[PDB]
Design a protein around this nucleic acid. Structure first.
Length: 117
RNA sequence: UUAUCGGCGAGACCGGGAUGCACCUCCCGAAGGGUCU
């Protein structure tokens, strides 16, 4: 139980672009600016978070591997729980909203869900 | 931090034509010399 802060630099080997609905207009494709066109753009943390969540999901599937049938053990519900984080079958541990520290069992049993809620 | 969760993405050759060239003397002036078996 330690807060690991990773601080560091991303050097861009090939240009780093992202399409965002607000950033892109009929004037043309622009990066998110946090202001006007003169402001300094930023690569959203959402895109990096999604990329790292997809990478973590790939790690989890590879660590689990496939069944004897050659099919992934995850169904659509589990797959969306691990990738997008939303319950599709309505079967999820609805913890009390006033319990900041809830889900310790799920957090221990599912480290992907723990990292990316 | 008024909660909890969400990669925006996928495709495209921008290329196709061109002589930069045509004229000019850079020359005009000079002793490097004298000394020692």
């Amino acid at each position: 139980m330690r807060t690991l802060n990773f601080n560091g630099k991303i050097s861009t080997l090939e240009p780093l672009t992202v399409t965002v609905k607000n950033a892109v207009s009929t004037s043309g494709h622009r990066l998110p600016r946090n202001g006007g066109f003169n402001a300094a753009p930023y690569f959203p943390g959402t895109s990096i978070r999604g990329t790292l969540r997809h990478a973590a999901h790939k790690v989890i599937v590879d660590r689990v591997g496939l069944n004897a049938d050659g099919k992934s053990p995850f169904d659509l519900a589990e797959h969306f729980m691990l990738a997008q984080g939303v319950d599709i079958n309505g079967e999820a541990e609805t913890f009390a909203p006033g319990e900041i520290n809830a889900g310790a069992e799920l957090r221990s049993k599912n480290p992907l869900i723990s990292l990316f809620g």
